[PDB]
Amino acid sequence: GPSRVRQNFHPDSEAAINRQINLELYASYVYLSMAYYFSRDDVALNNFSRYFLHQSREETEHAEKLMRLQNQRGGRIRLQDIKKPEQDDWESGLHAMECALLLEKNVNQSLLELHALASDKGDPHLCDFLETYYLNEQVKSIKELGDHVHNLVKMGAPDAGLAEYLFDTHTLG
Amino acid sequence: GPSRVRQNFHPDSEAAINRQINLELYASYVYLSMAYYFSRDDVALNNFSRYFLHQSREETEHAEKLMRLQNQRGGRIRLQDIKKPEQDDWESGLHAMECALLLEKNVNQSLLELHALASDKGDPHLCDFLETYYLNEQVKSIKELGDHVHNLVKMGAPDAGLAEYLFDTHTLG
Amino acid sequence: GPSRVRQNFHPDSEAAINRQINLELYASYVYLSMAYYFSRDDVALNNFSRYFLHQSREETEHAEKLMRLQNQRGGRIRLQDIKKPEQDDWESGLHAMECALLLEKNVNQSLLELHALASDKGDPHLCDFLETYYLNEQVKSIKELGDHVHNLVKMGAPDAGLAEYLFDTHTLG
Amino acid sequence: GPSRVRQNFHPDSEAAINRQINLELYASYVYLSMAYYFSRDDVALNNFSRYFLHQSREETEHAEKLMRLQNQRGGRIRLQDIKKPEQDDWESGLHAMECALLLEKNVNQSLLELHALASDKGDPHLCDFLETYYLNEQVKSIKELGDHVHNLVKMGAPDAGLAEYLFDTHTLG
Amino acid sequence: GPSRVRQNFHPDSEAAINRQINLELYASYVYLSMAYYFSRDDVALNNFSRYFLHQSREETEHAEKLMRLQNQRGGRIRLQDIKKPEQDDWESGLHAMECALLLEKNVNQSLLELHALASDKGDPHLCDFLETYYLNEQVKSIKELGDHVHNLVKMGAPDAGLAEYLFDTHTLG
Amino acid sequence: GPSRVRQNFHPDSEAAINRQINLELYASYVYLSMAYYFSRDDVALNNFSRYFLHQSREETEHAEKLMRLQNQRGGRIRLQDIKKPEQDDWESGLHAMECALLLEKNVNQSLLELHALASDKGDPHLCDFLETYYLNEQVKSIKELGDHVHNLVKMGAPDAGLAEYLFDTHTLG
Ligand SMILES: [Cl-]
Ligand SMILES: [Cl-]
Ligand SMILES: [Cl-]
Ligand SMILES: [Cl-]
Ligand SMILES: [Cl-]
Ligand SMILES: [Cl-]
Ligand SMILES: [Cl-]
Ligand SMILES: [Cl-]
Ligand SMILES: [Cl-]
Ligand SMILES: [Cl-]
Ligand SMILES: [Cl-]
Ligand SMILES: [Cl-]
Ligand SMILES: [Cl-]
Ligand SMILES: [Cl-]
Ligand SMILES: [Cl-]
Ligand SMILES: [Cl-]
Ligand SMILES: [Cl-]
Ligand SMILES: [Cl-]
Ligand SMILES: [Cl-]
Ligand SMILES: [Fe+2]
Ligand SMILES: [Fe+2]
Ligand SMILES: [Fe+2]
Ligand SMILES: [Fe+2]
Ligand SMILES: [Fe+2]
Ligand SMILES: [Fe+2]
Ligand SMILES: [Fe+2]
Ligand SMILES: [Fe+2]
Ligand SMILES: [Fe+2]
Ligand SMILES: [Fe+2]
Ligand SMILES: [Fe+2]
Ligand SMILES: [Fe+2]
Ligand SMILES: [Fe+2]
Ligand SMILES: [Fe+2]
Ligand SMILES: [Fe+2]
Ligand SMILES: [Fe+2]
Ligand SMILES: [Fe+2]
Ligand SMILES: [Fe+2]
Ligand SMILES: [Fe+2]
Ligand SMILES: [Fe+2]
Ligand SMILES: [Fe+2]
Ligand SMILES: [Fe+2]
Ligand SMILES: [Fe+2]
Ligand SMILES: [Fe+2]
Ligand SMILES: [Fe+2]
Ligand SMILES: [Fe+2]
Ligand SMILES: [Fe+2]
Ligand SMILES: [Fe+2]
Ligand SMILES: [Fe+2]
Ligand SMILES: [Fe+2]
Ligand SMILES: [Fe+2]
Ligand SMILES: [Fe+2]
Ligand SMILES: [Fe+2]
Ligand SMILES: [Fe+2]
Ligand SMILES: [Fe+2]
Ligand SMILES: [Fe+2]
Ligand SMILES: [Fe+2]
Ligand SMILES: [Fe+2]
Ligand SMILES: [Fe+2]
Ligand SMILES: [Fe+2]
Ligand SMILES: [Fe+2]
Ligand SMILES: [Fe+2]
Ligand SMILES: [Fe+2]
Ligand SMILES: [Fe+2]
Ligand SMILES: [Fe+2]
Ligand SMILES: [Fe+2]
Ligand SMILES: [Fe+2]
Ligand SMILES: [Fe+2]
Ligand SMILES: [Mg+2]
Ligand SMILES: [Mg+2]
Ligand SMILES: [Mg+2]
Ligand SMILES: [Mg+2]
Ligand SMILES: [Mg+2]
Ligand SMILES: [Mg+2]
């Protein structure tokens, strides 16, 4: 102590990165829950399932990149429990997509707060890291989910009998 | 003055070509507006967007071919402001297609007036140019848009929840 | 209720599968922690890191296969918090391997208890599932980790300066 | 209202992006005018023409990327008239290059003002977008045009009879 | 004066870039010295030599990219003497790696001061340039050297007879 | 001391090799300065730039081969500061080429003095090394630069507006 690599890396930044690692792992778990909701025999929308599973894997990648950043900068990873998602039953394709949009906006708000702290601590490496690997990816994800919610709402989800099925077999297929 | 190339090229034809260049640039801009309406998060019909973007690029090509004609004949290009489109909000896939059909018929009427002037001035090169590169392309575009309007109307656009989505993912996909 | 697919699937089996899903997710998290311990600047054994990361990914696969089994049989996945690992600092390559061996034996004991319950409930599909996809894989993993612990101990880990490095660059490389 | 995607996106940023879209479309139009000046029968420098046409197409791409950004962030595109360029007659290869350098510096100043507003509004996504896709491209364009102006001046443009021709057939060829 | 390209480029930034060019050239020279220490007949660690030679070449690239930046922005390169390194005799593989880690942290501190000046002068192009091409590369280099120092220390360098040789023929080979 | 490899290698030869290493590094730096003079926005002769950059890289190679010779013979490299070049502003393509010719003749004179010392000390290995790798390369470089100076002078450099540009785009292109 300190790490022989550590430079210009504030303890508050190190802790905020640890909190962000937990949030990305939590997001991965929410999407995993959603993926296996869509493969229930009474839901059976396999392209919704594959969509959410892919999202889950992406979140794990986001978490891992933060863990690598912690090591690269000489901070120490401190893991915490990954809380279970809010639901096992996600009710419908539309409801899952709306919950996913809210989750992505929440994660985005956390990333923006992290970038603000990094700016406050004069850490341009950390600022650049978030800008390069996180902020644009989050904007793209939010826009994609917004698009999906809009189409499902317009199509008459969740009550219209064909809407989720047609969306499954066209947009997500 | 005159250009050492100029031959059998009436000043009224030169001016009418300048007006047509502006109209084709205006059409390009209308279709650009439409393309980015369809990629709004609250519209999200990406194949409508690609359709209109392609139309926009075609209109720019039409404008450029007239600019090349002006130079080939020894006339002088005189550009004017490109007016903004009538709307940013194009309301629905059906409404955009109806507006596009009206725009194409209006551009066609201008081309027919240009051909009539070229005939009046005994300019068979200009007549041939419009016939070869413009008049049939315009008839094809009008027919395609008419077809698209018909299908959307029959399908129950804009109020029927599935119509624009199914048209997006079948006809324009 | 019941699921139109459910057959010969006891509620106690459904719950025990939910507990096993949590344990496999927990194992994934332990191995993730270990992987990023080995890429600290003050540990720097990249082949230990890759070894544990691969183990982490395998555990996630094991969890997912149980989630698929729950759906296939008409049970309902119920996720719980994934507890953080026992340590962030895993002390040495030998200590991590010893902890991993203990974790695998613990997971094995849980699988054997699950198989015993499935036998008690006359569920041969569930018995076969565990035998085909879990029990032999666990025996192989335990043997591999036992082998690695033995070599590290014989080589003089953790105090012998060359032992972990040579093991990293030969066995795990 | 607001867009279900909108987050951390200030109305002043949304308006400034709309102004920048207009400026990039205006730049595209200036370069289009220049391209077709160089293919007049009394100028006839086809590599100047191709150079400016390529620049025109690049500006349209820059405009489109801002329109996509507006949609991605949940803002609303508002288009305005595209003003005609300052000249149809661009006088000489040197004069066109000097006008293009001034236009690029003016567009750069607008981008720098946009980045300053984005910083003031704590919008790091928008800051990153301009840095990643705009600011370096503008510096490169300004340097290239500066280089071209220098060579043409040194060579004795516009009065030296060989200068524009040799530059056309070597540098731009 | 000023350069016809110069825009938003403060004289203090231009001078700080000149100082950074000298520091990167100095770093190249330190690593060149180290490379040829390791090919002495009484050291004879050819993979240490190749490692440092590669580092030397990278530093020259870093210097050249700053020289290109100076030209792109319209500043004027002003070169100074490149001071000789602190030693010809670098004592051991461990000592060279420790000196290289200190040199990289020193260069990093200079880059962070340059980024701070660029922020103070409202030069986002220069900020982006350092973030994109310098700051992450420096963090990666510091982490790699930290890793190498750790392994050599753990292995018993410099006194343990096998440590530098085994590191040479495994990690650097 | 002595090196177990050293044989027939006089201390005066070892020192003269150290002086020659410094001179070749100095030559590399002169050519680097010249290369980036030619990419200034107010010079903009990219093939002059590439020519000098290649020369710079060759000089570094010449320096490195002497450093390898020092090690092969059991001498000890002793580096000194690399002095900055005589100018940042090299005035014109002709002036740079004339300065480069003078620099190469000066380096040649040093090599001839080194060969004379090696002959005086009865060191045929060192004589052969200079003959095989240095003396003919220097004669070729001097002749090439002489040729380039002649053409630029005949063409009317530096005042004739086309001369440096045409030389850039034909001989160096
Ligand atoms: Cl620190
Ligand atoms: Cl969608
Ligand atoms: Cl329906
Ligand atoms: Cl006529
Ligand atoms: Cl149709
Ligand atoms: Cl419908
Ligand atoms: Cl049952
Ligand atoms: Cl083993
Ligand atoms: Cl040992
Ligand atoms: Cl070994
Ligand atoms: Cl907002
Ligand atoms: Cl140029
Ligand atoms: Cl001339
Ligand atoms: Cl300035
Ligand atoms: Cl290492
Ligand atoms: Cl040893
Ligand atoms: Cl001797
Ligand atoms: Cl020559
Ligand atoms: Cl001349
Ligand atoms: Fe995604
Ligand atoms: Fe990914
Ligand atoms: Fe991925
Ligand atoms: Fe992906
Ligand atoms: Fe994420
Ligand atoms: Fe809880
Ligand atoms: Fe996400
Ligand atoms: Fe920034
Ligand atoms: Fe078309
Ligand atoms: Fe076309
Ligand atoms: Fe086309
Ligand atoms: Fe087409
Ligand atoms: Fe048209
Ligand atoms: Fe108007
Ligand atoms: Fe049209
Ligand atoms: Fe395994
Ligand atoms: Fe597997
Ligand atoms: Fe696997
Ligand atoms: Fe495997
Ligand atoms: Fe497992
Ligand atoms: Fe706990
Ligand atoms: Fe396991
Ligand atoms: Fe069996
Ligand atoms: Fe360009
Ligand atoms: Fe482009
Ligand atoms: Fe392009
Ligand atoms: Fe391009
Ligand atoms: Fe632009
Ligand atoms: Fe006007
Ligand atoms: Fe531009
Ligand atoms: Fe940035
Ligand atoms: Fe490196
Ligand atoms: Fe490189
Ligand atoms: Fe390189
Ligand atoms: Fe490299
Ligand atoms: Fe560097
Ligand atoms: Fe000194
Ligand atoms: Fe470095
Ligand atoms: Fe960036
Ligand atoms: Fe050469
Ligand atoms: Fe060479
Ligand atoms: Fe070479
Ligand atoms: Fe060569
Ligand atoms: Fe040389
Ligand atoms: Fe001096
Ligand atoms: Fe030379
Ligand atoms: Fe001889
Ligand atoms: Fe010889
Ligand atoms: Mg949290
Ligand atoms: Mg009109
Ligand atoms: Mg448990
Ligand atoms: Mg404006
Ligand atoms: Mg200095
Ligand atoms: Mg000297």
Phi, psi values for residue C156, rounded to 5°: 100, 15
Domain borders along chain A are: 11-171
Task: Kindly report whether the peptide bond that precedes residue A158 is cis, defined as omega within 30 degrees of 0.
Answer: yes
F85·E79 Cβ contact <8 A: yes
With a CB-CB cutoff of 8 Å, which residues 128-157 of chain E face chain C? 143, 146-148, 150-151, 154-156
Q: Length of chain E in residues, anyone?
A: 173
Compute the distance between CA of residue D150 and CA of residue C103 in angstroms, rounded to an integer. Answer: 72
Chain-centre distance for alpha carbon C154: 25
- Rounded Cα distance, D82 and D30, in Å: 10
CA distance A163 to A169: 10
Rounded Cα distance between C4 and A62, Å, is 38
Contact D149 E7 (CB under 8 A): no
Comparing CA positions, the residue from D141, D149, D148 lying closest to residue D27 is D141
Which residues, in sequence order, are CB contacts of F106 under 8 Å at separation 6+?
none
Residue C42: count other Cβ atoms within 10 Å of its Cβ. 16
Cα–ligand 15 centroid distance for A74 (angstroms): 15
Residue A93 CB-half CA count within 13 A: 34
* Backbone CA torsion sign across D144, D150, D152, D154: negative
CA D72, CA A136: separation in Å to the nearest integer?
10
Q: Are E59 and E27 in contact (CB under 8 A)?
A: yes
Residue-wise DSSP of C90-157: --SHHHHHHHHHHHHHHHHHHHHHHHHHHHHTT-HHHHHHHIIIIIHHHHHHHHHHHHHHHHHHHHTT
Q: How far apart are CA D32 and CA C128, in angstroms?
A: 72
- Tokens 């080194």 belong to residue: F114
What is C11-171's CATH number, 1.20.1260.10, 3.40.50.2300, 1.10.150.570, 1.10.3470.10? 1.20.1260.10
For residues F120 and F101, what is the distance between their CA atoms, to the nearest angstrom? 29
Q: Partners for D (CB, 8 Å, 3+ pairs)? A: A, B, E, F
The closest alpha carbon to C92, from C41, C140, C46, C157, belongs to C157
How many alpha carbons lie under 13 Å from residue B25 in its C-beta half-sphere? 27
Residue C24 to residue A12: CA distance in whole angstroms: 33
| Of E51, E44, E37, residue with least CA distance to E91 | E37
How far apart, in whole angstroms, are the C-alpha atoms of residue E112 and residue D78?
40
Other CB atoms closer than 10 Å to residue A75's CB: what's the count? 23
Structure tokens, B137: 């392309």
Q: Name, in order, each residue with C-beta under 8 angstroms of A72's C-beta and a sequence gap of 6 or more.
A: A5, E139, E140, E143
How far is the alpha carbon of D171 from chain A, nearest alpha carbon, in Å? 36
Which secondary-structure segment (H or E) carries E134? none
DSSP B82: B
DSSP assignment letter at E135: I
In the numeric block, the tokens 């927990």 are attached to C26
Burial A24-38 (b: 16+ CB within 10 A, else e): bbbbbbbbbbbbbbb
What span, in angstroms and rounded, lies between the C-alpha atoms of F127 and A167? 82
Exposed (0-12), middle (13-18) or buried (19+): which is A81, by Cβ within 10 Å?
middle
Q: Given CA atoms C48, C54, C55, C60 in this order, what sign does their dihedral have?
A: positive
Instruction: Give dist(CA B63, CA B69) in Å, integer.
Output: 10
Angstrom distance (rounded) from CA F157 to CA A15 = 65
A5: closest CA of chain E, how far (Å): 6
Smallest Cα–Cα separation from E21: which of E60, E56, E63?
Answer: E63
CB atoms D81 and B76 under 8 Å: no
C81 pairs with which residues across the strands? none
Residue B65 CB-density burial (10 A; 0-12 exposed, 13-18 middle, 19+ buried): middle
Distance CA D85, CA B147 (A): 38
d(CA B114, CA B19): 10
C-alpha dist (Å) from residue A147 to A143, A144, B170, D73, F28: 6, 5, 18, 12, 58
Give the E-state strand segments of chain A in sequence order: none
Residue keyed to tokens 């900055």: F84
Alpha-carbon gap, residue A133 to A17, rounded angstroms: 14
Residues A111/A73, Cβ–Cβ less than 8 Å: no
DSSP state of B52: H
**Contacts with B36 from chain D: Cβ below 8 Å:** 64, 67-68, 70-71, 77
Specify the residue for token string 């804009």: B158
Best of D43, D62, D77, D89 to disrupt the B interface by mutation (most B CBs within 10 Å)? D77
Asked if omega into C158 is within 30° of 0 (cis), the reply is yes
Q: Are C85 and C29 in contact (CB under 8 A)?
A: yes
Residue pair F168/F47 in contact (Cβ under 8 Å)? The answer is: yes
Determine contact, residues E141/E104, Cβ cutoff 8 Å: yes
Q: How open is the CA angle B137-B138-B139, to the nearest 5 degrees?
A: 95
In sequence order, the 6+-apart residues with CB closer than 8 A to the CB of C153 are C94
Both tokens assigned to F107 = 């380096």
Question: Nearest C-alpha of chain F: how many angstroms from E77?
Answer: 7
For residues A117 and A10, give the distance between their C-alpha atoms in angstroms, rounded to a whole number. 10
Q: Is the dihedral of CA C73, C79, C84, C86 positive or negative?
A: negative
Beta-bridge partner residues of F82 = E82
Does D113 contact chain F (CB < 8 Å)? no
Helix residue ranges, H only, E74-156? 93-120, 124-130, 136-155
Spatial distance between the Cα atoms of F24 and F28, rounded to a whole number of angstroms: 6
- A17 to chain E, any CB pair closer than 8 A? The answer is no
Residue positions forming the annotated binding site of A for Fe cation: 24, 59, 62, 104, 138
Contact D111, D139 (CB under 8 A): no
**SS3 state at B108:** helix
- Say how many Å lie between the CA of residue B72 and the centre of ligand 27: 50
Longest dimension (CA), chain B: 62
- Counting ligands in written order, the one closest to the CA of D55 is 43
**Residue corresponding to tokens 């288009």:** D79
How is residue F148 written in tokens?
A: 């380039």
Contact C43 E146 (CB under 8 A): no
The DSSP secondary structure of D63-102, one letter per residue, reads HHHHHHHHHHHT-------BPPPS-S---SHHHHHHHHHH
Interface subset of A 49-68, CB within 8 angstroms of D: none
What separation, in Å, do the N-terminal and C-terminal C-alpha atoms of chain C show?
52
User: At how many Å resolution was this determined?
Assistant: 1.7
Sort out which chain E residues have CB atoms less than 8 A from A70's CB and list them: none
Which helix (DSSP H) or strand (DSSP E) does residue A164 occupy?
A: helix A163-170
Residue F36 touches chain E, beta carbons under 8 Å: yes
Q: Write b or e for each residue in C102-119: b if 16 or more Cβ atoms lie within 10 A of its Cβ, otherwise e.
A: ebbeebbebbeebbebbe
Compute CA distances C60 → A58, C26, C65, C166, E166, whole Å.
14, 9, 9, 29, 36
Query: What H or E segment, with its residue span, contains residue E44?
Result: none
Q: Which of B12, B6, B9 is nearest to B113 (CA)?
A: B12
- The tokens for F91 are 């005035």
Tokens of C130: 């565990």
- B81: tokens are 């402001």
Contact at CB, C80 and A80, closer than 8 angstroms: no
Q: How many whole angstroms separate alpha carbon C133 and alpha carbon D126? A: 49
Q: What is the largest CA-CA distance in chain D?
A: 62
Shortest CA distance to D55 belongs to which of D170, D148, D163?
A: D148
What are the Cα distances from residue E37, in Å, to C8, E156, E165? 75, 21, 15
Ramachandran quadrant class, C44 (left: phi over 0; alpha: psi -120 to 50; beta: rest): left
Q: Are E20 and E111 in contact (CB under 8 A)?
A: yes
Cβ-based neighbours of A54, under 8 Å, separated by 6 or more = none
CB count in 10 Å sphere of residue C159 = 9
Helix (H, G, I), strand (E, B) or coil at A82: strand
- Residues in chain E with CB shorter than 8 Å from the CB of A71 are 143
**In terms of residues, how long is chain D?**
173
C-alpha distances in Å from residue F110, one per residue of F17, F67, F68, F116: 10, 16, 19, 10
Q: Is the peptide bond before F85 cis (omega within 30 degrees of 0)?
A: no
The burial class, CB within 10 Å (0-12 / 13-18 / 19+), for B7 is: exposed
Residue B12 to residue F99: CA distance in whole angstroms: 64
Round to whole Å and give the CA distance between A78 and D53: 56
A38 and A52 in contact (C-beta within 8 Å)? yes
- For residue A122, the surrounding DSSP H or E stretch is none
**Dist CA C166 CA D16 (whole Å):** 60
- Which one, of A54, A34, A62, A57, lies nearest residue A136 by Cα? A62
- In angstroms, how far is CA D158 from the centroid of its own chain? 24
**Residue from B38, B42, B46, B168 to probe the interface with A (highest A Cβ count within 10 Å):** B42
Q: Which of D158, D155, D145, D94 is nearest to F168 (CA)?
A: D155
DSSP notation for D3-54: -TT--S--HHHHHHHHHHHHHHHHHHHHHHHHHHHTTSTTT--HHHHHHHHH
In chain B, which ranges are continuous DSSP H helix? 11-37, 46-73, 93-120, 124-130, 136-155, 163-170
Residue of A3, A72, A122 lying closest to E139 (CB–CB): A72
**Contact (Cβ atoms closer than 8 angstroms) between residue C69 and residue A113:** no
Omega prior to A11 cis, within 30 of 0: no
C138 is in an annotated binding site: yes
Phi, psi of D152 (to 5 degrees): -65, -40
Task: Round to whole Å and give the CA distance between D85 and D19.
Answer: 17
- Contact yes or no for F114/F54 (Cβ under 8 A): no
Classify E82 as helix, strand or coil: strand
The reply to whether E119 touches chain D by the CB within 8 Å rule is no
Q: From the list D3, D67, D85, which residue is nearest B36 (CB)?
A: D67
CA distance D23 to A168: 41
Which ligand sits nearest to residue C23's alpha carbon? 70
Contact with chain B for residue D76, Cβ under 8 A:
yes
Determine the distance separating the centroid of ligand 72 and the alpha carbon of E11, expressed in angstroms. 17
Question: In one letter, which amino acid is A52?
Answer: F
Q: CB atoms < 10 A from the CB of F101, how many?
A: 18
Number of separate helices (H) and strands (E) present in chain D: 6, 0
Distance CA C93, CA C70 (A): 36
Residue-wise burial string across D78-115, b where 16 or more C-beta atoms lie within 10 A, e elsewhere: bbeebebbeebebebbbbbbbbbbebbbebbebbbebb
Which two tokens mark A63? 């978490």
Instruction: Report yes or no: E159 at the F interface, CB cutoff 8 Å.
Output: no
